[PDB]
């Protein structure tokens, strides 16, 4: 849930990349292989963060406190 910051191997900061990622996918229709590149994730240690990530914090927010 919610965008692992940094990265489980290389340690590059992957957190901020998330928003711009969804931006690219929704707005520009670009496929992931292009998106991650334009974001500047060169190694695939990073790439698996964004790509494989499953964001559940959304489905958590919909409950009333």
């Amino acid at each position: 849930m919610i965008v692992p910051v940094r990265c489980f191997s290389c340690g590059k900061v992957v957190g901020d990349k998330w928003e711009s990622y969804l931006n690219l996918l929704q707005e520009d229709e670009l496929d992931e292989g292009t998106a991650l590149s334009r974001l500047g994730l060169k190694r695939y240690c990073c790439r698996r963060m964004i790509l494989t990530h499953v964001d559940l914090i959304e489905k958590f927010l919909r409950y009333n406190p």
Partner: protein, 159 residues
């Protein structure tokens, strides 16, 4: 903390957030300073207030941290924004009445203690792009030269 995220879950993410270390040289270690707990000599104090306003989902950003502690005019502790849009690390989300207010105490350390101090992302190390030294024999099926990719750095050494 009213958030859906568990508290220490948050304090974890905060632990990972890079900070501006340029002048860190002159910030002493915790165990070195003789005060009790922390001070402006051994530490930098950051705090964060997030109160969800809009009906739409509000986002807590790394930029929302604020430095309350006197810095003695030395360059430290500013949460770093490498994004082009100028937001940075996404700490937590909030809906409406969910509020988050907390205080962070930033201290000096090195990676061996905890990886959240590691300054360097992956470091590419290579030598002898051609195999001339024979430190490595190549697994192959028919020929090793065809199969094994030509490394880019090969260009800067002789065939």
């Amino acid at each position: 903390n009213t958030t859906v995220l568990a508290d220490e879950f948050i304090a974890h993410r905060l632990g990972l957030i890079p900070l501006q270390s340029m002048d860190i040289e002159q910030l002493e270690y915790s165990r070195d300073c003789f005060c009790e707990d922390h001070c402006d000599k051994c530490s930098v104090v950051l705090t964060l207030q997030a109160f969800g306003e809009s009906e739409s989902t509000t986002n807590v950003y790394s930029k929302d941290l604020v430095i309350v502690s006197n810095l003695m005019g030395r360059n430290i502790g500013h949460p770093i924004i490498q994004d082009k849009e100028g937001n940075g690390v996404l700490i937590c989300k909030l809906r409406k009445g969910q509020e988050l207010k907390l205080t962070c105490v930033a201290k000096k350390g090195i990676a061996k203690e905890h990886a959240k101090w590691g300054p360097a992302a992956a470091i590419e190390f290579e030598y002898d792009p051609w195999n001339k030294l024979k430190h490595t024999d190549y697994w192959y099926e028919q020929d090793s030269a065809k199969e094994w990719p030509q490394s880019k750095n090969c260009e800067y050494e002789d065939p």
